[PDB]
Structure 1
Amino acid sequence: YFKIYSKHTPIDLPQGFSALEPLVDLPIGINITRFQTLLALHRS
């Protein structure tokens, strides 16, 4: 199972407390070891 929790807020990480609600579950069944982030460049 792949579970994703999330939280959004309008603001070094800040000092405070905020809990995260569950929003996604995916019945995948995979062996994961590595990952990467995807950007969106601003073309001139």
Structure 2
Amino acid sequence: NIDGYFKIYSKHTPINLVRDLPQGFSALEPLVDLPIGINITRFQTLLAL
């Protein structure tokens, strides 16, 4: 979240393990640099039960 932008870079890939995050390389392209320009200190996630 910079320059008055919110900065989201991302990627979509699979995994084939059981309980971990993997090794192996990749890169994240951008998603959006959002024109919000606010102050943020923390957050929470959202997930559907």
Tell me if TM exceeds 0.5.
yes
Larger RCO: Structure 1 or Structure 2 (Cα < 8 Å, ≥ 6 residues apart)? 2
* Structure 2 gap segments, 5+ residues each: none
Structure 1 ranges of 4+ moved more than 6 A:
none
Normalising by structure 2, we get a TM-score of 0.74
In the TM superposition, residue 10 of structure 1 has moved relative to its aligned partner by 1.2
In the TM superposition, residue 39 of structure 1 has moved relative to its aligned partner by 1.2
* Structure 1 gap segments, 5+ residues each: none
Q: How many residues align?
A: 41
Aligned counterparts of 1:29 and 1:10: Cα–Cα separation in 2: 33
In the TM superposition, residue 7 of structure 1 has moved relative to its aligned partner by 0.8
